[PDB]
Amino acid sequence: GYSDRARSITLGNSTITTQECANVVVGYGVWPDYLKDSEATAEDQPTQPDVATCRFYTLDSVQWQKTSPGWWWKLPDALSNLGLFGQNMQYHYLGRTGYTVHVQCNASKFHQGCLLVVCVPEAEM
Amino acid sequence: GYSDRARSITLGNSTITTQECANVVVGYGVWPDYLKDSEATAEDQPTQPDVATCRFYTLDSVQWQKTSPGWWWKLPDALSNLGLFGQNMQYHYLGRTGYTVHVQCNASKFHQGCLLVVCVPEAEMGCATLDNTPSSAELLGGDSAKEFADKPVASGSNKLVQRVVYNAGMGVGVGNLTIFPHQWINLRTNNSATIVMPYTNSVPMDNMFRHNNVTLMVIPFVPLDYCPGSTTYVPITVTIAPMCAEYNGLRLAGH
Amino acid sequence: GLPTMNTPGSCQFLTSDDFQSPSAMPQYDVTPEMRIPGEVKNLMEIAEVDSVVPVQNVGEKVNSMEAYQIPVRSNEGSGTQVFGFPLQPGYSSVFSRTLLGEILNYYTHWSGSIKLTFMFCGSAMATGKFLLAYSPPGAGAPTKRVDAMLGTHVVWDVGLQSSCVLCIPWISQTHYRYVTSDEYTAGGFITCWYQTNIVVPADAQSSCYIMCFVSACNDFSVRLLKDTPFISQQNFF
Amino acid sequence: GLPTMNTPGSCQFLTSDDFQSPSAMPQYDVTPEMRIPGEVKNLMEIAEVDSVVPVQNVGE
Amino acid sequence: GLPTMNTPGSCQFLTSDDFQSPSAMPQYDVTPEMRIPGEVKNLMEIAEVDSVVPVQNVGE
Amino acid sequence: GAQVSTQKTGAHIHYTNINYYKDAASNSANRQDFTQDPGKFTEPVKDIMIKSLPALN
Amino acid sequence: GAQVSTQKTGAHIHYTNINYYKDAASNSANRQDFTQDPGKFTEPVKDIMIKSLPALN
Amino acid sequence: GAQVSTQKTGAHIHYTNINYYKDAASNSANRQDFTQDPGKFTEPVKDIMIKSLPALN
Amino acid sequence: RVADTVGTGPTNSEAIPALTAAETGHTSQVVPGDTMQTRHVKNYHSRSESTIENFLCRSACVYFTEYENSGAKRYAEWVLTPRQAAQLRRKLEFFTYVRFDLELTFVITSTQQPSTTQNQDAQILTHQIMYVPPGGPVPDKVDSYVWQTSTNPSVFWTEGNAPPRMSIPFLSIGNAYSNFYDGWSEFSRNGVYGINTLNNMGTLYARHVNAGSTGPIKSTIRIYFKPKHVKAWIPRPPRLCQYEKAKNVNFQPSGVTTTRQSITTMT
Amino acid sequence: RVADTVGTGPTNSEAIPALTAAETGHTSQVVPGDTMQTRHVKNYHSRSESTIENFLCRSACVYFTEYENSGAKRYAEWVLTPRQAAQLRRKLEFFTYVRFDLELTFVITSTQQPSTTQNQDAQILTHQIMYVPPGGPVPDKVDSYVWQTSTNPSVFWTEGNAPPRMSIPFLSIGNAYSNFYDGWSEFSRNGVYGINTLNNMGTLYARHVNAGSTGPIKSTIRIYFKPKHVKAWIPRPPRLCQYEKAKNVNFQPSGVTTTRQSITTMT
Amino acid sequence: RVADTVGTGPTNSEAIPALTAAETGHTSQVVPGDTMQTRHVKNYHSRSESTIENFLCRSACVYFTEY
Amino acid sequence: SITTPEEMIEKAKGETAYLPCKFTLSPEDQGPLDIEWLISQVIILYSGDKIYDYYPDLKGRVHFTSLKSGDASINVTNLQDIGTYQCKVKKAPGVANKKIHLVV
Amino acid sequence: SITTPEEMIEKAKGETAYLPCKFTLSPEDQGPLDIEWLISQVIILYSGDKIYDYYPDLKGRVHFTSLKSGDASINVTNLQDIGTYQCKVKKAPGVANKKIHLVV
Numbered sequence A: 001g002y003s004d005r006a007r008s009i010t011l012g013n014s015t016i017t018t019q020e021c022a023n024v025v026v027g028y029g030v031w032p033d034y035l036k037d038s039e040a041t042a043e044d045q046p047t048q049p050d051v052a053t054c055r056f057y058t059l060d061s062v063q064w065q066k067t068s069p070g071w072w073w074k075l076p077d078a079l080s081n082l083g084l085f086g087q088n089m090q091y092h093y094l095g096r097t098g099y100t101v102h103v104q105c106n107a108s109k110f111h112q113g114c115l116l117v118v119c120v121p122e123a124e125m
Numbered sequence B: 001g002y003s004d005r006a007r008s009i010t011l012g013n014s015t016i017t018t019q020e021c022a023n024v025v026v027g028y029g030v031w032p033d034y035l036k037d038s039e040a041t042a043e044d045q046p047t048q049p050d051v052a053t054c055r056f057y058t059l060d061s062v063q064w065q066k067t068s069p070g071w072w073w074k075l076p077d078a079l080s081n082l083g084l085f086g087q088n089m090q091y092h093y094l095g096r097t098g099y100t101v102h103v104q105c106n107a108s109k110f111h112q113g114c115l116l117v118v119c120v121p122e123a124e125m126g127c128a129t130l131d132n133t134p135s136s137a138e139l140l141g142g143d144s145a146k147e148f149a150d151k152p153v154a155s156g157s158n159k160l161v162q163r164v165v166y167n168a169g170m171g172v173g174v175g176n177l178t179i180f181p182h183q184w185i186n187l188r189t190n191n192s193a194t195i196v197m198p199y200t201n202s203v204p205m206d207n208m209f210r211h212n213n214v215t216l217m218v219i220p221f222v223p224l225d226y227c228p229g230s231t232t233y234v235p236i237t238v239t240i241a242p243m244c245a246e247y248n249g250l251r252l253a254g255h
Numbered sequence C: 001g002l003p004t005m006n007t008p009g010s011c012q013f014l015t016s017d018d019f020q021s022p023s024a025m026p027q028y029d030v031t032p033e034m035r036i037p038g039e040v041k042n043l044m045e046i047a048e049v050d051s052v053v054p055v056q057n058v059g060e061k062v063n064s065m066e067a068y069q070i071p072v073r074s075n076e077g078s079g080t081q082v083f084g085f086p087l088q089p090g091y092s093s094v095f096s097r098t099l100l101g102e103i104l105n106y107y108t109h110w111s112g113s114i115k116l117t118f119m120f121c122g123s124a125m126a127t128g129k130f131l132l133a134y135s136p137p138g139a140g141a142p143t144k145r146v147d148a149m150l151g152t153h154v155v156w157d158v159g160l161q162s163s164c165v166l167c168i169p170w171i172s173q174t175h176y177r178y179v180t181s182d183e184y185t186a187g188g189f190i191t192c193w194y195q196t197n198i199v200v201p202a203d204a205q206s207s208c209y210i211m212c213f214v215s216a217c218n219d220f221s222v223r224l225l226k227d228t229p230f231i232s233q234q235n236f237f
Numbered sequence D, E: 001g002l003p004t005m006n007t008p009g010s011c012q013f014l015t016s017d018d019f020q021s022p023s024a025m026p027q028y029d030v031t032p033e034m035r036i037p038g039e040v041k042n043l044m045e046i047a048e049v050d051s052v053v054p055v056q057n058v059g060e
Numbered sequence F, G, H: 001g002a003q004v005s006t007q008k009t010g011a012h013i014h015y016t017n018i019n020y021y022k023d024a025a026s027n028s029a030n031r032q033d034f035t036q037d038p039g040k041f042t043e044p045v046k047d048i049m050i051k052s053l054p055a056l057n
Numbered sequence I, J: 001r002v003a004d005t006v007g008t009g010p011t012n013s014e015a016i017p018a019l020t021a022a023e024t025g026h027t028s029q030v031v032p033g034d035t036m037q038t039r040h041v042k043n044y045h046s047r048s049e050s051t052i053e054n055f056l057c058r059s060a061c062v063y064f065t066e067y068e069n070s071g072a073k074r075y076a077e078w079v080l081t082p083r084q085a086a087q088l089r090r091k092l093e094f095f096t097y098v099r100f101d102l103e104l105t106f107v108i109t110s111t112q113q114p115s116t117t118q119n120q121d122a123q124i125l126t127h128q129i130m131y132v133p134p135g136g137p138v139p140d141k142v143d144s145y146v147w148q149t150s151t152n153p154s155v156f157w158t159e160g161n162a163p164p165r166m167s168i169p170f171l172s173i174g175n176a177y178s179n180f181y182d183g184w185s186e187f188s189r190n191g192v193y194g195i196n197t198l199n200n201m202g203t204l205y206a207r208h209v210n211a212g213s214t215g216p217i218k219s220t221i222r223i224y225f226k227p228k229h230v231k232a233w234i235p236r237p238p239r240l241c242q243y244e245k246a247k248n249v250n251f252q253p254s255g256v257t258t259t260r261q262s263i264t265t266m267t
Numbered sequence K: 001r002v003a004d005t006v007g008t009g010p011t012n013s014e015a016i017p018a019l020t021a022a023e024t025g026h027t028s029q030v031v032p033g034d035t036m037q038t039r040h041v042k043n044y045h046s047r048s049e050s051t052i053e054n055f056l057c058r059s060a061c062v063y064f065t066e067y
Numbered sequence L, M: 001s002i003t004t005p006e007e008m009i010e011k012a013k014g015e016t017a018y019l020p021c022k023f024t025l026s027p028e029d030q031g032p033l034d035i036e037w038l039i040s041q042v043i044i045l046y047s048g049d050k051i052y053d054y055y056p057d058l059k060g061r062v063h064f065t066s067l068k069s070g071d072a073s074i075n076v077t078n079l080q081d082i083g084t085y086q087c088k089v090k091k092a093p094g095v096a097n098k099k100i101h102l103v104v
């Protein structure tokens, strides 16, 4: 007997644990997988580090003030200079990958606020 | 469907009920029982009141201030003057018993503090002087608090006991005192701590008046804190309940 | 007269030999064992228990109960360092005096994992997140939260369950490590940063403490019995 | 020449040891035992007997 | 006391003898062997290999 | 009446032993006694605590 | 031709012994001979005296 | 529990041995271990080279 | 033998092995495979050298004393106690109650003392070691009738052979030796406080059977204890403060540990 | 046992056992019967004395030191290392990695030193040898409390008996001893370069338990290593240049071999 | 091995184990269970060290002389 | 084992000074008993079951309070006497001593 | 083990001479630390965790750069000082020494 508010995620040598959370949204009902042999086009063999890239990278924090409009990040551009994920994409010509976005904002009972977290594909600006 | 945070203990004509608690520690995995026929040595028959002693006795409370080092109690010496438990041990020569220690400290969400509750068997304590030994009525206290003291006790020709909290009066690290059965009271979560201790000794029965089996210690690792306005007087209360107690060698009263 | 021949190593005394010897008290009746609770059969049952770690052993804190406490507070920033210390269970000032560390001081080699439990000791209204990280040797101590993330880390979220466990695994080239300070068999570094910031409401204390307990996993081992460097006897007491 | 090795505790005399020793009078014929009454096999048969106690051991 | 007798050659040290001796570190757990390539079991495997011969070892 | 036991070897032999005294406190030490039970010191609680489930629910 | 006997142990092991002389007064002492009979010194009467009954009726 | 093995004799006898310690690093050396395999140092190639055939054809 | 590490993979679930409560004693039984991805690794390491028998069963000097063959100090005496030294005492004080057989070894060495006598051609010295049980007669002098050792166990040694070793059975009226005692011997609770009350191990006497020369000679005896067949109960924390006396646990308060420079300092 | 020679006869064929390519490592596996006529000869020669065990398993002195019974130098110390001597080191440096149990033997001899004291009638000397593991306390003086040897293994010897011998198990954190190491202990690559980085064998201490006389006496101890149960990997060429230091492979360039008179000279 | 103590209870009867005659040598063979209530106690104590062999078989100096 | 070996006693002048040296004989200790009082050189001596009365100033002033039972205390008088008194009790197997500091 | 035991340092006059003696303590070596600087007769001495300032010409000129960590170097000044300096570091189990030649 446990509480659905508690969740743990383990990827690579990294873990995150939540005491209060809502749920996990799984995109369009699809869990990310590898490229099949009937959908591929490139002939040469792919590399798959499998552990040195697929872990958790923590970006710089941002202060939420009383008059902040909002923030945006490009997921491919954000991890360009971080760890071995950046190095692999630098040397290679073609890269295919999926992601997860854990956003953490903790406040006391007295504090009141609302934040919308959405992922936009082809978010041309 | 209930919550594991709620517990009730019934002994004799007494009960305790907790709304918030951690768990129950059961000593060294042993639940206290009576003396078998292959482990006994005394011939004459034991007495077993079974109800008039094995109940809950509530000792005097102690104020937890912002600068309290800690407190210690001798479990055999503490219940010497309380109820029929004291009277039975007075008349008899040999006494064998087990105990439980329910320590209660309740504070609000705003209050923050940490308390360590540990039972130490054969907790021999040292004297301030290196040549002499601690006097009685200085180490022992009847229903009394017997608090510790940050910083060393002065060295002179006096049977004073060394009360340093960091050495704990035994000359060992205060942190490593987790080797004995211990429970932590965290004001933000745990409100009380329950520990069950089986009889532990190198002999089957022992004279309760001249020997102490265990020493209960309550030490605030993290101090008590709050903001102006909240309640300042925050007390700690201790209840002890002898379990499976038996006595032998009835004679004239005294010690 | 059976003809025999004495080999080298006769009539010598060995501090560690296993021979039989004639009893000086023949036909002695020992007392029948009674069941005393809590029997120790191995020293690796004393080491698998938690022990408070003096992380703040700075200045005169060692002469106070303040050494055990790790001070956390509310600051106008993020990614600041809470604490950090090397992974030397027998030699580091931080672990030399804990149960497991004291046991290691009687051995030359040690090999296994290490559990580090952290308990939050603030108000029940205060909330926050911490990043606990372990970095393998090769490049120096991480100086930023970003450098620390690249190593083994766990993001701890304070809630109903106050404690958290970072399990430092066995990453070594050799099979065993040296209890004594050595450079070939180096340990690593263990650091703690602010994943977010401590959030406190009004009329509550914004300066909290954490406590750290250290123990061994189910795969710990030790070797080469030696003499502890801690005890010193001037003369027969 | 069987190779052996001497352990500590050799060539010592123990007031309470149990070893064999070469008899100095070989092939000696001892006298045949006769049944004498009242044989003691343990010292706790001498102790289970009553003995007058000097309680008034005062002065002369 | 088993009667024995010491033969010549006792209490001597031989640079090339084969005896047992009491271990100074009792119940020691050695590291499990790993397979390292190229194990030598005899010195006549080092000798069956070719080696360049200095035939013109004249003067400097 | 001799006892044959196993020698302490590495991983990845038998030896013989006879008792020459009648005292049982003259024998050699018992070095090969590998038995552990840390469930007394560690996990000394009444209600069993599963690892995956929460501690206090 | 060796004799195997029991060692003296506590309550709540075997040992081996061989005789190397031909004299029977060279052997070791007989320490394990536990036989008592105090009915000679204590209770040395002719008519048996039961415990519960009176001595002289 | 004794082991009987063969002695080193000329060409063109058995001996007895017992282990008296419980350590496995106390026994005598292993002198009679006659096993060779020079196919590692000599002939360390991938494609096997027969003697009679040419080396490089 | 130690447990082998298993292999786990990526996980997204409600299970929380890491998050727990240290308020309860319950030492978390988590393994690395719960907070990261691990590979399968067989572990052939064995928990053998850490057993209490291998820990305690090694000889350790507990007391060394002198005597002469002329003058005033002609024999030596020492009540049996393992608290004279620090190394053996600290190791034994990891536990509250211990129960073990004891193997005793002695090392006796003589030394010719400075004098002015001439023509000193000494003979081999023989030494006698005698034990007196709690209550036995004690020798007033070096030629007392006590040395007849009718019942007391004794040992004679001629200088030059292997040291003398004897084995002693568990001697106690209790069911275990007590390293720590919290209480008094007298009921009135006014007297000796501590383990001293329980201890009763008798006295040991050593001396020269013969003079052996006309010049002075001083002999020294060192005693070595080895615990065999060990049993131990209720473990307790190791001694931080240095020892002061042999009868009690009197100590001087000292720092919990050594100090560094900062809280983020790596040295 | 060695292979027996077979018998061949006259041959005229296309087979070419002799002609081959030494560009490939392939050491030609030709036998005399391929380039001449041979007779059948049974060979009872056995390849027994050439095995690594028979090669390495022989005692060999590695270090001898002195101490006194009076004055300043009262005890001796030596970090365990087989590179002190040349004969044992050269034989061990035929291989890169070795793994063997060690048998230790000591030879202790005393000598009465010149002085002017009178009436010197000495007693038998007893010597104590003590081992300190990498991290153990080391004795500051000759009467230090370190010699209590509670856990350190030690040995006592009375002058006149067979030498003292003990057996040591493979002690290493690795899987094989390394005779040669190419690298550094520090990652920054600026410090000690060589095997010295890997070595960690502890220290050995020897001393007189008693003085034994009024005149000076100097004792000397010689240490003897015997490798048992040997395993060896990856052979390497024997040392040509003479050794210079014990920590490194520093050498002085020397001639590949000795010189003769001509290229056709037979001497 | 020594005898084990048994368990008795309250008794009101004509039996008189305590009352006896010491005029006769008859050493009273009474046990504590006859004059009080006792509990059952197994006794593993053994009468071994008291035998005449263990009592007398120890070396003892009888005479020392010079020449 | 003499209780409170380190002790300081403050007694006013004109009042008899009471010095207590109570001891507990060890079971191991079974030898002739000797009790000696030192003033820092002796004031009184008990040996072979005999009491001897050593110090000219304290002659006729120092006497025992009880010795065989286990109490070897003295009661001094006519204080003027500032000094340290060491009570040394001797048993053949073991020995103990207590030092008392007297002011005025 | 002191790195570069044989070393030669050429320093111009009027420039402080920097002499470096960095060492790596052995795991076997666990004893009291002593650092001694010889001029070929001492300029400075570090012993029992105490620094002593020996040479009249170099008095008030020789001082350590850092010792406990593992660096025992000195920084001399007012060169005129041509000589050989031997840095000898002592641990109870093992000892090491480095000699530096200074020109002008």
Ligand SMILES: CCCCCCCCCCCCCCCC(=O)O
Pocket (backbone or CB within 6 Å): C024, I080, I081, I082, I092, I098, I102, I104, I129, I130, I131, I153, I154, I155, I166, I168, I171, I177, I178, I179, I201, I204
């Ligand atoms: C010549 C004969 C000598 C025999 C001497 C026997 C002395 C035995 C002493 C045993 C002491 C054991 C003390 C253990 C105390 C403890 O473990 O706390």
Ligand SMILES: CCCCCCCCCCCCCCCC(=O)O
Pocket (backbone or CB within 6 Å): E024, J080, J081, J082, J092, J098, J102, J104, J129, J130, J131, J153, J154, J155, J166, J168, J171, J177, J178, J179, J201, J204
């Ligand atoms: C009195 C006890 C003495 C015990 C001393 C044990 C010391 C063991 C030293 C082993 C050294 C082995 C070094 C091998 C190095 C190599 O093969 O390259």
